[PDB]
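Hi team,

Filling in the usual template for the complex we talked about on Friday. All components are listed, including any nucleic acid strands or ligand strings, so the model treats them as one assembly.

SUBMITTER: L.P.
PURPOSE: interface mapping
COMPONENTS: two
RESIDUES: 73
SEQUENCES:
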Amino acid sequence: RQLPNQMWMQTGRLSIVEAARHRQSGYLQLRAGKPNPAGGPFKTSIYHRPIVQAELTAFCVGDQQGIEALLSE
RNA sequence: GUGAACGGUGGAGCAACACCUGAAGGAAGGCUUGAUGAGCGUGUUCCCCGCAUACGCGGGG
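RESULT (copied from the run log):
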């Protein structure tokens, strides 16, 4: 580890405002009048994934030329 | 088939209201724009200094 381990918050939110505009215009065919951030298509969800900046060392048995081309891609 | 692949930290919110930098404090006290310079004497070959190189030029008291 080159860095202290930190945490990435990320969220998934479907835009309720844009969906309301599209539902009024009819581009979105949604009969339901109310969103739900707890669950469903409009679930605003929060999720935290751990983050490390480090040096990655792997030991194996393989041809040097073949691995180098794959990891160069 | 990288325990992957997929995933918006978002929406709203006045820093602002009131509040006298200045009350008092001497530019003063002495001082000719008139002085200085602008007119009155010597009566003929004698000491020093350079250029020369003595045929003489220059200067000096």
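MY TAKE: DSSP finds two helices and two strands in chain A. The beta strands of chain A are 6-12, 45-51.

Thanks, L.
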